[PDB]
Each structure stands twice: as C-alpha cells, then as structure tokens.
Design an enzyme around this catalytic site. Structure first.
Site, PDB file in Angstrom:
ATOM      1  N   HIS A 140       0.930  -1.231   0.018  1.00  8.35           N
ATOM      2  CA  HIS A 140       0.031  -0.192   0.131  1.00  8.35           C
ATOM      3  C   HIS A 140       0.999   1.302  -0.057  1.00  8.35           C
ATOM      4  O   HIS A 140       0.562   2.503  -0.298  1.00  8.35           O
ATOM      5  CB  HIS A 140      -1.048   0.122   1.132  1.00  8.35           C
ATOM      6  CG  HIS A 140      -0.705   0.189   2.630  1.00  8.35           C
ATOM      7  ND1 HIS A 140      -0.395  -0.778   3.307  1.00  8.35           N
ATOM      8  CD2 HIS A 140      -0.131   1.653   3.072  1.00  8.35           C
ATOM      9  CE1 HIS A 140       0.186  -0.233   4.531  1.00  8.35           C
ATOM     10  NE2 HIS A 140       0.181   1.240   4.212  1.00  8.35           N
ATOM     11  N   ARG A 161     -15.724  -6.652  12.508  1.00  8.16           N
ATOM     12  CA  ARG A 161     -17.050  -7.022  12.179  1.00  8.16           C
ATOM     13  C   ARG A 161     -17.062  -6.363  10.683  1.00  8.16           C
ATOM     14  O   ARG A 161     -16.661  -5.229  10.596  1.00  8.16           O
ATOM     15  CB  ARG A 161     -17.988  -6.662  12.819  1.00  8.16           C
ATOM     16  CG  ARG A 161     -19.341  -7.742  12.799  1.00  8.16           C
ATOM     17  CD  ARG A 161     -20.562  -7.198  13.015  1.00  8.16           C
ATOM     18  NE  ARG A 161     -21.723  -7.877  12.253  1.00  8.16           N
ATOM     19  CZ  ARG A 161     -22.987  -7.217  12.321  1.00  8.16           C
ATOM     20  NH1 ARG A 161     -23.300  -6.488  13.294  1.00  8.16           N
ATOM     21  NH2 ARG A 161     -23.740  -7.920  11.614  1.00  8.16           N
ATOM     22  N   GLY A 203       2.258   6.561   9.445  1.00  6.33           N
ATOM     23  CA  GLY A 203       3.731   6.603   8.897  1.00  6.33           C
ATOM     24  C   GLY A 203       4.566   5.276   9.558  1.00  6.33           C
ATOM     25  O   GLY A 203       5.653   5.290   9.167  1.00  6.33           O
ATOM     26  N   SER A 207       3.612   2.268   8.682  1.00  7.20           N
ATOM     27  CA  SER A 207       3.253   1.265   7.561  1.00  7.20           C
ATOM     28  C   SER A 207       4.416   0.795   6.892  1.00  7.20           C
ATOM     29  O   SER A 207       5.492   1.551   6.540  1.00  7.20           O
ATOM     30  CB  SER A 207       2.489   1.688   6.896  1.00  7.20           C
ATOM     31  OG  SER A 207       1.113   1.554   6.980  1.00  7.20           O
ATOM     32  N   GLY A 208       4.460  -0.563   6.652  1.00  4.28           N
ATOM     33  CA  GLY A 208       5.596  -1.107   6.040  1.00  4.28           C
ATOM     34  C   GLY A 208       6.694  -1.750   6.561  1.00  4.28           C
ATOM     35  O   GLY A 208       7.412  -2.487   6.438  1.00  4.28           O
ATOM     36  N   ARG A 239     -13.208  -8.489  16.615  1.00  2.00           N
ATOM     37  CA  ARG A 239     -12.939  -7.003  16.646  1.00  2.00           C
ATOM     38  C   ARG A 239     -13.221  -6.242  15.310  1.00  2.00           C
ATOM     39  O   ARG A 239     -13.305  -4.929  15.261  1.00  2.00           O
ATOM     40  CB  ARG A 239     -11.548  -6.692  17.168  1.00  2.00           C
ATOM     41  CG  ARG A 239     -11.001  -7.290  18.409  1.00  2.00           C
ATOM     42  CD  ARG A 239     -11.945  -6.964  19.576  1.00  2.00           C
ATOM     43  NE  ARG A 239     -11.737  -7.872  20.709  1.00  2.00           N
ATOM     44  CZ  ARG A 239     -12.773  -8.315  21.307  1.00  2.00           C
ATOM     45  NH1 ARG A 239     -13.821  -8.159  21.112  1.00  2.00           N
ATOM     46  NH2 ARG A 239     -12.525  -9.148  22.261  1.00  2.00           N
ATOM     47  N   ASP A 249      -0.491  -7.647   1.594  1.00  2.00           N
ATOM     48  CA  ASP A 249      -0.033  -6.324   1.458  1.00  2.00           C
ATOM     49  C   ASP A 249       1.402  -6.432   1.657  1.00  2.00           C
ATOM     50  O   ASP A 249       2.020  -6.282   2.873  1.00  2.00           O
ATOM     51  CB  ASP A 249      -0.674  -5.294   2.699  1.00  2.00           C
ATOM     52  CG  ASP A 249      -0.269  -4.024   2.480  1.00  2.00           C
ATOM     53  OD1 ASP A 249       0.269  -3.677   1.654  1.00  2.00           O
ATOM     54  OD2 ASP A 249      -0.623  -3.300   3.539  1.00  2.00           O
TER      55      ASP A 249
HETATM   56  O1  LIG Z   1       3.914  12.836   6.238  1.00  2.19           O
HETATM   57  C1  LIG Z   1       2.994  12.517   6.903  1.00  2.19           C
HETATM   58  O2  LIG Z   1       2.416  13.241   7.609  1.00  2.19           O
HETATM   59  C2  LIG Z   1       2.836  11.188   6.879  1.00  2.19           C
HETATM   60  C3  LIG Z   1       3.527  10.095   6.380  1.00  2.19           C
HETATM   61  C4  LIG Z   1       3.432   8.843   6.011  1.00  2.19           C
HETATM   62  C5  LIG Z   1       2.062   8.438   6.242  1.00  2.19           C
HETATM   63  N1  LIG Z   1       1.611   6.985   5.943  1.00  2.19           N
HETATM   64  C6  LIG Z   1       0.442   6.173   6.316  1.00  2.19           C
HETATM   65  O3  LIG Z   1      -0.588   6.876   6.644  1.00  2.19           O
HETATM   66  C7  LIG Z   1       0.540   4.928   5.561  1.00  2.19           C
HETATM   67  C8  LIG Z   1       0.335   4.742   4.071  1.00  2.19           C
HETATM   68  C9  LIG Z   1       1.449   5.286   3.267  1.00  2.19           C
HETATM   69  C10 LIG Z   1       1.257   5.183   1.986  1.00  2.19           C
HETATM   70  C11 LIG Z   1       0.078   5.093   1.445  1.00  2.19           C
HETATM   71  C12 LIG Z   1      -1.058   4.786   2.131  1.00  2.19           C
HETATM   72  C13 LIG Z   1      -0.946   4.782   3.553  1.00  2.19           C
HETATM   73  C14 LIG Z   1      -2.079   4.858   4.477  1.00  2.19           C
HETATM   74  C15 LIG Z   1      -1.752   3.762   5.911  1.00  2.19           C
HETATM   75  N2  LIG Z   1      -0.421   4.197   6.319  1.00  2.19           N
HETATM   76  C16 LIG Z   1      -0.267   3.830   7.825  1.00  2.19           C
HETATM   77  O4  LIG Z   1       0.666   4.335   8.093  1.00  2.19           O
HETATM   78  C17 LIG Z   1      -1.367   3.193   8.410  1.00  2.19           C
HETATM   79  C18 LIG Z   1      -1.283   2.489   9.829  1.00  2.19           C
HETATM   80  C19 LIG Z   1      -1.798   1.678  10.585  1.00  2.19           C
HETATM   81  C20 LIG Z   1      -1.198   0.379  10.659  1.00  2.19           C
HETATM   82  C21 LIG Z   1      -1.622  -0.332  11.674  1.00  2.19           C
HETATM   83 CL1  LIG Z   1      -0.990  -1.931  12.118  1.00  2.19          CL
HETATM   84  C22 LIG Z   1      -2.653   0.039  12.693  1.00  2.19           C
HETATM   85  C23 LIG Z   1      -3.217   1.073  12.497  1.00  2.19           C
HETATM   86  C24 LIG Z   1      -2.812   2.182  11.233  1.00  2.19           C
HETATM   87  N3  LIG Z   1      -3.636   3.233  11.324  1.00  2.19           N
HETATM   88  C25 LIG Z   1      -4.729   3.650  11.339  1.00  2.19           C
HETATM   89  N4  LIG Z   1      -4.904   4.818  10.755  1.00  2.19           N
HETATM   90  N5  LIG Z   1      -3.677   5.357  10.817  1.00  2.19           N
HETATM   91  N6  LIG Z   1      -2.625   4.557  11.132  1.00  2.19           N
HETATM   92  C26 LIG Z   1       1.104   9.210   7.023  1.00  2.19           C
HETATM   93  C27 LIG Z   1       1.313  10.575   7.095  1.00  2.19           C
END
Ligand SMILES: O=C(O)c1ccc(NC(=O)[C@@H]2c3ccccc3CCN2C(=O)/C=C/c2cc(Cl)ccc2-n2cnnn2)cc1
Length: 238
Positions: free
Chosen positions: A44, A163, A186, A188-189, A161, A93
């Site tokens: 993603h 549904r 941020g 992620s990955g 958790r 993913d």
């Molecule tokens: O520079 C910034 O402000 C900035 C930089 C990178 C980012 N990345 C992101 O948003 C990245 C990302 C990167 C590229 C494409 C899509 C996305 C969307 C999802 N994503 C998360 O990390 C997801 C975390 C996540 C993971 C788990 Cl296991 C649990 C809860 C989570 N979250 C739910 N809501 N938030 N987190 C944002 C903000």
C-alpha cells in the site's frame, strides 16, 4: 507509534526509512532489510508511486534529522508488489524493493531473519512494533524511531474486533484489549519483530487498523510466515 518510547541507536538495525522525493522529500513508509539488496515493506506504500526513481532507502538511521541532501541512501532498482494485492484490508499487503547497490552489513544495519515454515506453530511472547509514525491520529512524523512491545492476538479474537472485514490467516493481529500501544500513520511497511530463542524474526509487516491504538481494534499486519515462499520466489529467481 502510539504509547511508544525512543529506541536506542542500533536497536532495530533491519529498520529502514523509505523516503519519496516527489513532490518534496519526506518519509513515506517503514521497511526491513531481509537480504543485502532486499527491503521487505507493504504494497500500500506505493499507491502514489509511478517509478522507483523517486524512492530513497535510508538504513542505520535513528533520527530523521540525520537525513540531509549529503546523507547516503540506497536507490531502488525495482518495486515488486504481490500480484494478488488490491488493498491493505483484503491482504497480500507485501512488496519487495530491489536496491541498486548492496547493503554493507555492520553494527548499524543488518538483516532480520524471516520466520521458519515449521515455526508457524510457535507462540511469540516478545513482539515489538517500530517506526517514525504519529503518536496520535492528528500528529506528525517523529524524529526518533519509536518502539512499543505489543501482544499478538489470535485470528479468532481479531475477527471479533473487525466485524464487516475478513481477517485471513495471511494476516496477523497485535494489540492490547484496552488499546494504547500500536502502529499509527507513517509506521506502515515497518516490522513487527518477535524475539524467539534469542533470535529476532520478522513476524509481521505493519499494514492497517481502525484508527490508532483504539480499545478492541488491534493493529493488522501481513503474516510474513505465509509469504516466505513468495519472498524466496522473488529474491532467489534464477
Ligand atoms: O508525512 C506524513 O504526515 C505522513 C507520512 C506517511 C503516512 N503514511 C500512512 O498513513 C500509511 C500509508 C502510506 C502510503 C500510502 C497509504 C498509507 C495509509 C496507511 N498508512 C499507515 O501508516 C497506517 C498505519 C496503521 C497500521 C496499523 Cl497495523 C494499525 C493502525 C494504523 N493506522 C490507522 N490509522 N492510521 N494508522 C502518513 C502521514
């Protein structure tokens, strides 16, 4: 990382910061070194990315402030996204980055072992999620790499958790029932690293969740053990 603490330099030497230079340079995602030219991360992360030419991988970094125009990085030769991937919430993913040059291993940067196929039936009790992500939903990328110890959650409990979602065995969940410690924007990955018999294993890849560290909303991670054959396919190609 919500409810995390500052890591110590060299604590997570497989942790990388994946930056994009388009439109401007910034941290995009976490990743893990798994081989001397291989980064394992989430598919993603590449939603915006039309070319590997805009990507920079930085290893051996504790603080994002260590990164300037003169800081060395690894260029990306190729982005390999699982061909069944559609979206984080549906699974698959996982992505590999083939680096243009070889990572020289040392006390600041080294690979993390992949889980063993046999170890699919082992109980991990010492798991940690790391990253430079937000400490809360409305926040910013953190300077210092954060860490949080997080308990693994059974697939059955995770499905309760979520549904309306399908939590597959290719996913692994982690989080405290009352919330508080989790991945956030941020992170992620990046890795979900578990220590077993004094060896760290890459058990998960931070993928998705409903909000950040919410009560009864565990973090959902790619279950790396279910993809060892796919990783070897792509990295050991003849
Ligand atoms: O520079 C910034 O402000 C900035 C930089 C990178 C980012 N990345 C992101 O948003 C990245 C990302 C990167 C590229 C494409 C899509 C996305 C969307 C999802 N994503 C998360 O990390 C997801 C975390 C996540 C993971 C788990 Cl296991 C649990 C809860 C989570 N979250 C739910 N809501 N938030 N987190 C944002 C903000």
């Amino acid at each position: 990382i919500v409810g995390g603490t500052a890591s110590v330099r060299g604590e997570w030497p497989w942790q990388v910061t994946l930056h994009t230079t388009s439109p401007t340079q910034r941290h995009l995602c976490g990743g893990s070194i798994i081989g001397n030219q291989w980064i394992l991360t989430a598919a993603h992360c590449f939603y915006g990315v039309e070319s590997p030419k805009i990507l920079r991988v930085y290893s051996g970094i504790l603080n994002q402030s260590e990164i300037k125009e003169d800081t060395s990085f690894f260029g990306v030769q190729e982005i390999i996204i699982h061909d069944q991937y559609k979206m984080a919430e549906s699974g698959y993913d996982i992505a590999l980055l083939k680096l243009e040059t070889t990572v020289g291993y040392g006390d600041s940067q080294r690979p993390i072992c992949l889980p063993s196929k046999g170890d699919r039936n082992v109980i991990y009790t010492d798991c940690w999620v790391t990253g430079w992500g937000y400490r809360k939903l409305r926040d910013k990328i953190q300077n210092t790499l954060q860490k949080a110890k997080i308990p693994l959650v059974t697939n059955e409990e995770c499905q309760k958790r979520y549904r309306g979602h399908k939590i597959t065995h290719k996913m692994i969940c982690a989080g405290y029932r009352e919330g508080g410690k989790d991945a956030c924007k941020g992170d992620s990955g990046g890795p979900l690293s578990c220590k077993h018999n004094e060896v760290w294993h890459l058990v998960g890849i931070t993928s998705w969740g409903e909000g950040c560290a919410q009560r009864e909303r565990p973090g959902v991670y790619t279950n790396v053990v279910e993809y060892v054959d796919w990783i070897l396919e792509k990295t050991q190609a003849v």
